[PDB]
Amino acid sequence: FQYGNYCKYYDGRLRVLKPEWFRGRDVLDLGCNVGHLTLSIACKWGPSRMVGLDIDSRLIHSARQNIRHYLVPLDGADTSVFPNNVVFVTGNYVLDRDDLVEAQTPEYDVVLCLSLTKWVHLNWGDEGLKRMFRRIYRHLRPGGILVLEPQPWSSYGKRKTLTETIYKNYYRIQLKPEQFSSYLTSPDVGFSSYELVRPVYLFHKAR
Numbered sequence: 001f002q003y004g005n006y007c008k009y010y011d012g013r014l015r016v017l018k019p020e021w022f023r024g025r026d027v028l029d030l031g032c033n034v035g036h037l038t039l040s041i042a043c044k045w046g047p048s049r050m051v052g053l054d055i056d057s058r059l060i061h062s063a064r065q066n067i068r069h070y071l072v073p074l075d076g077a078d079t080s081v082f083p084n085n086v087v088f089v090t091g092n093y094v095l096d097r098d099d100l101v102e103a104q105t106p107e108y109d110v111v112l113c114l115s116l117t118k119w120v121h122l123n124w125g126d127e128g129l130k131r132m133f134r135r136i137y138r139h140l141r142p143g144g145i146l147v148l149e150p151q152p153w154s155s156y157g158k159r160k161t162l163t164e165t166i167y168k169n170y171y172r173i174q175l176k177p178e179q180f181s182s183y184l185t186s187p188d189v190g191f192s193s194y195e196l197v198r199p200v201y202l203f204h205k206a207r
């Protein structure tokens with residue numbers, strides 16, 4: 001469970017997230033896990049498109065089986081209403097090179113990156129996390145928002161001995177959680193502004 005990839009059930013987060021951010025918008029949920037939040041938002045708040053992405057296919061299978069527990073669209077040609085507005089995909093959001101990140105064209109209005117930063121940081125280092133952040137920016141359409149819930153540096157130490165890669169990265173990291181807001185709003189990423197809503201932040205892409 002080196003990617004934090006075990007089945008996590010909590011959702012209290014819907015009290016902090018605002019429905020207006022999601023209604024009629026295209027949403028990408030990074031590290032969706034078993035997709036309880038993906039399904040709750042997709043159902044309760046009507047996004048036009050909701051995609052849940054996770055590296056672990058066992059979580060994606062479970063997420064797809066969970067659709068039945070949440071159960072109206074007119075038929076298959078109507079993808080505007082739950083359950084026809086949600087899909088799950090297995091994949092690593094972290095691209096290998098910077099030239100690959102630059103090939104990403106916009107597709108979403110909202111990107112949810114909740115409790116993911118630590119797992120990405122430990123497994124793929126500063127380089128990998130910078131690439132995830134830059135990809136989120138490039139994937140968002142002008143006017144888009146990134147919902148970020150990062151883990152504090154204090155959380156990194158515990159289980160730094162999971163992998164040899166995780167250990168080498170824990171001692172090589174220079175971009176610390178406390179510096180994430182400044183990095184995301186820098187020319188390296190591009191976000192125009194940020195705000196505070198673990199703590200939850202909103203990063204804005206210029207219209």
Ligand SMILES: Nc1ncnc2c1ncn2[C@@H]1O[C@H](CSCC[C@H](N)C(=O)O)[C@@H](O)[C@H]1O
Binds near residue numbers: 003005032056
């Ligand atoms: N590079 C990556 N790409 C996609 N998913 C990733 C990833 N690294 C880790 N993950 C997934 O992200 C999750 C971290 S746990 C956070 C779960 C959820 N977003 C929440 O807030 O409850 C795990 O399910 C893990 O498998």
